[model samples]
Target: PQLHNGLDFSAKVIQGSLDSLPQEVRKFVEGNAQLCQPEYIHICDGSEEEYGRLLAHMQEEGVIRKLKKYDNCWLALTDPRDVARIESKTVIITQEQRDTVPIPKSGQSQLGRWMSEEDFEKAFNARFPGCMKGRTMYVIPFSMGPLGSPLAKIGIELTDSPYVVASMRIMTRMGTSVLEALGDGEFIKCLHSVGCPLPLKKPLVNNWACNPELTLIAHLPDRREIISFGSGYGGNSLLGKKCFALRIASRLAKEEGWLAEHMLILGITNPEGKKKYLAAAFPSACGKTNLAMMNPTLPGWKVECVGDDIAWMKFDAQGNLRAINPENGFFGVAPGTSVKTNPNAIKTIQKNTIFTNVAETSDGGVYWEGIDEPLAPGVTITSWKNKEWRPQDEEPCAHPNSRFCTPASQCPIIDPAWESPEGVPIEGIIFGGRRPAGVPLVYEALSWQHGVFVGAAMRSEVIMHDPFAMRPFFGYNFGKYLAHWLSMAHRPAAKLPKIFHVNWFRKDKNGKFLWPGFGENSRVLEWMFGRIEGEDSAKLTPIGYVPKEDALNLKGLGDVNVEELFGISKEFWEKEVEEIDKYLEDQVNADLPYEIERELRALKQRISQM
Candidate 1:
């Protein structure tokens, strides 16, 4: 009998194949391969010493999930956690699962399973080695490449399209999944139509990776290409994502000095027609999509969104910063969005998407009339608080907590022209947060360090409503991922784009956003517009920011505080302006006036409470 894609074989063959093993071993092997889906099939008739060595080898490969020992023969299942989302429906996996599952403790999830230590080595030894080559792993055998023959018995139907299979992989990683059992292409097409769709944002050919060692869920295959190194939040949580990419980047750069030609560059523009600017590098929830759509001073203010999730950015030998977005479309978390930031993007994606624990609607969909778009079919809206929001059957989407999951392309605001494989030069970098106080709504940074400092401000979901009450449940590194870019050696790509900080936190006492404080978001944009128009130095007043403990620590940044950390400023602290001038000159040759002074004349009014 011929082997099927993803390990699908007859019960007779499975049982017969185990005849050589000890009776106990044969039964265990039959139970797993014949009855249970085996992520990996391990056969060990060798000595106990050899078995131990094989197990060690698999562990090093990072595919081990659990071990089934039935006497002489040992069968290990490779990552059998697939079909979990369909089985256990939820968006965020609770902490209870960490001990049992090998998935990421945090982030999105879908379907997939954990592999066993022994089986992991058999697969790894046959394929990838010391360095990450062919980082992609096959779960459903049908999804495998030329190297996927070993996974045939797993029950996946083979097909030509890797894209469809890749989406399934992401769903598995997301944990509580929804779209896995559905038809791959049609389901994906429907998802892409909605703004809240899963992350199919990055393209495949740019590079790929899968880190079984780091997390059980499969990762983007681009892990070995782009290198992300930083400190604080950027180092551990966020930069680590670029591990596979860095490996790939080093190889490609060494082989072919041209990064743009070697990769599918995204979210960038070469305004000067000389060098590719680094693409936009905004924090997770910032208005990155909004700014991407913003009309700027470039020759053709055409905005391109490479990968809304990740990008491969670097400088070529010709001395130009180029960026390659690994994917397309946006996969942003939307809790609080405004018309000013993304009027079109917000409107388009409201329909055909799933919204997690945010809210419940009477009909199964959000009544967001704010944007002009069509609603998705079978909209099962329910009130988050209402008890009537119950699915009659406890099978399939039986969980009352199942939220809306929509595709991003469904959003009407998505621009088709932005989908290009070419590279773009980054004009500026904008780092903003969801702060309602202390920080400005927007402001340009004097230096990259200042922007990094502002981005360092931390925020958490549980702590928002209940601070101390939620301590036990929260992790120590809550906001680490948000501050990833601050650790840049030369402070991100200087010539790619200017740096700007923003805050969207609303104030209670005051009706308007705080200026010289959180309102600096506006000032930063104003400065960029000035530069676009050929103005040398654009200065604005800094809005007085609320005195948060984190904001106060920024005050000790030597000469960082000029105007209000939010608004604009025109002041100098200990000849600090000279250093910023020197750094910008050395990096981008950007020459600006040092005459800018402090904005707030009365320092006493700017209360300081640590």
Candidate 2:
């Protein structure tokens, strides 16, 4: 059994440190001994001269008498919230508090406290049992561009402690940047020691209040600031695409209490230029942004990414797929993409972009340009802020504080008539995880659920993640997010679209790409995408470098084919897809295949009558 003598305290950033302990403490004489870990503690390393200067400041503020110091640890009792509290309660030493805390006494680190230092160490170990060797981390504001690349300026080193390494105490703001920084090899070493990675999704089963919860909010002030779109985690990355999605989602969610409105439902086209929209139910960073700029390869093939990051998906009265671009430009990350594969999209976006912390040139400077072919409203370049270390200004000059708030009406890429005519009917779906080794890139859709899960599972392989969220979250909120999905699945659409799962993990037999893990699998994807025509000639084709196809025949595709195309076997895909198909086919549809077609005619007739 342990004795409690101290209490726990909390503080925020930029808070000052303590200097002394009150010995004549009337509280102690009256049998008051309350011990607690401070909430905030900011320490600076400097000479005694600096300490004296600060002491003078304290004296002038009438806090001098309270600034006395103990030998090793400055222990001071303070009424921290006295000023804010209307009704103040002085310290009352309680047996329960004392019983839980250790009373510091002698030569040992525990200081005669019930909870010894060894106990604290054990607690820490239990919390962070993973390995965190050879790891280093860096943090930067979203202005430093995206975490997809790290050669930019404004990046700061983050110290690896038990709390951060274990994801207990997380960054509320700039979470995307912090997560991306962990991709660095130096940072990975630390994570390896601590066994850090995307944690399993455990919901309310665990009691977690003090545990930091990260909420990536979509809304933010329209501050006039410069932003770069060169990295996956940069403001530019959020620009035109995901940023548009963020902005649109924020507005609709706030106004109509809905997830998407005026959604920019972009997708790939077969070699014949036939469209195949993706099946996703959430906001940015969930593959919608990536799919927007997908480079499918048809002679007249063109992917008009209305908004890469943002969209306003909704079911109109007629129930169709109508989408619009919520922003004027495309915000994208191009560090890993090259001209060889995603040439058209890359070249189009390269112009008028603010490149940051990318690989430095021999002259020790960075290079950037405007979009190759901007809209008639043309390129708007922002004035560069003086971040000497930053290769270029983080924000784009013409962008309003590096934002693209152009409504769809003023935007260049969107079909306005789409709103009333009903949205485009979805044809296919895809799903899969990244695989740098024996996995293929393009494949046929297995089932609706497989498509949804695989689409949900796809993520970027740019090592570190740089979040461009204007409002970031603290801890992973899988429970709330999952709830959001449950509600979204209730939306009404004629067909739930087909799904295909692909793995784009990058690697070589010699383990070059998979040094720590695998590298980006875009190249393999392009290869497989090029061959989708041969695999399933009727339903599959290449759109630029990405593959497009209809529903997957899981059982017919064979296990080896399933294992080769998606990371999972055909049986697994079959089970999951069948479940989703059963729900949609049985629960949603009002009739059999032919009857379903008849219902559509009857619906059209009813609309005409109205």
Candidate 3:
């Protein structure tokens, strides 16, 4: 019936509701159809039937293969070149070419590229038009948090990748219900394409399709929009996640007096029946996910996962700091996840999971490095790229950053209030980084400002991580991000969460970890519980408040000399301060918060006195 730009816009459209959408959504769909020239357009309602249809379609195209052993599970091996998030190609766009750009001395912040809006439009209009010819454009309406929640934000992502559609279904709350929740409210606009024009020649080839050279995870913070091109990997294609939840939402949170962070939310009930909620930030390679789903080694103490990544925090009516995990699922790194390190994560992926770039096992199972169990006897492995594997081969079977997308509902340790609209009151906040030496097992900040300093100066050697492990996720300048953390304390009648820092990777002279990490990290947390209750006092060191030798309960932990674990090598710390300060200098901008400088000075003085 209706003709749009000489194209029949009605024929291939599939939605349970044929009624008109909001004018904004309608206009976008109409315009995008003309620009991308897709063969069909489908608006998702996020129903079980809709999911099944999409699953079948993906199978039909050979994009996904059902795992023979797992129920409702599938494996996808992406193009080897497209296995990880390409930070170099990602960028943030602003109206003024130079304004709000954080230029570090080392080059672009490991965060991403920064381009002006004018240049972006020029590049986008030139490259994005008609890029999806011969493919289907799937319109997905997704919510970052629980439907109808005060903290949730709505977004509609238009994409041509069925893989993205399937993953988004599990990673976010999507469907007609999200449209219902909008009801004329503001929503983030997200557009994505694999940048592959469907083949007009031989049937569109390749199990994976992406344009790495053209890949861009561009964020328009001012417009509340995201336009991702090229890559089909996790965050680049799943617009609802890091793109919207962290990159765009962080800017929104700053303006609205809330916080959007790269952190995990956990709810723990102690042996004494005391319940406390905590939010912790750890750089990549740190155990953020494991901590969220840990089975405590301390008998009678229980840990329940609230969320494994991304936190939205604000002051609730009670004037207390509150936080919630906006995502409904876990987009966890597959490597380093095992029953020993995290049994709960393994349990979460047992059913209804999607494994990306994981090696194939002869038993019809997914395998990766660091998996607790080995394959059946004499079984061989197929590399994620589908090649026969040998130990001598340079690369591992799976990419180090290979991922699993699984529903939070399947997590055995998922907290009951994880999806609560009101969110949970946070009792403490923890900042952690990986340091084989220098930093101790744990230390509590003297105050909120001190805590901010700890987070701002955190260091990680493996992955280039910025403050709060949000190097690539913070939508705006690091200077302003630090200020926002400081400003939270000024909220009237609001109680701030106590802050602490931990380094589980501290090592002994033999180069072995001094702390028995994993679930036993609970021992460190057991100390914080007392600190929160004010029942325990710590010896204030120049670094911060450390345990008083007897503060950390080492019972049942044989021969764990707390002295070496908590020892501060003055020589190591002096070098540590120099390195962290240099890092801060490299990232400082005109917007750098004054309080951060003062905190840094106080830290240097405190350590100098020691």
Best by lDDT: 3
Residue pairs with backbone overlap in model 3: none
Global fold similarity of model 3 (TM-score): 0.96
**What TM-score do all the candidates reach, one by one?**
0.40, 0.36, 0.96
Best by TM-score: 3
Worst lDDT window (10 residues) for model 2? 82-91
Writing each residue's lDDT as its tens digit, candidate 2 over 1-610 gives 1265233211222222221212221121111111111122222222234334544443354322221111211101111111011101101111232221122222221101122334433443443332122222211112112233222112111222221211111111123333334332222000101122124232311111011121111212122111111012222222222322343233324334333321235544445655544333322323343454455332344454444443334434444433333333443333333343334444443222223222222232222333232222422221222223232455532221121111222223333332322334433333333345443455543333323333323333432111111112101111222233334445664334444444434355454433111112333233333343344433322211233333332222223232334332334334433443333243223212333233334323433443
Rank order (by TM-score, best first):
3, 1, 2
Scored by lDDT, model 1 comes in at 0.29
Residue 580 deviation, candidate 3, in Å? Answer: 2.6
**Which scores greater on lDDT, model 1 or model 2?**
1
lDDT of 3 by residue, 1-610 (tens): 4454365477668664335567677667767887888888889988988898878878887998888888889888888768878877788888653334556766545444688778788879865888889888989988999887899899989999989998999999988888877867788999999998867422333578888778878999888789999889899999987999888998899889899988999998888999999999997788899899998898889999999889999998778887878998999999889989999998889899999988888778888888967666777788888889864578888889999999999998899999999899999999998787778899999888989988888787552446888877778777777888898788788898989999989877899998889999888888888899997568889899998867787788899967888888778777777777777776664555788878778888877878
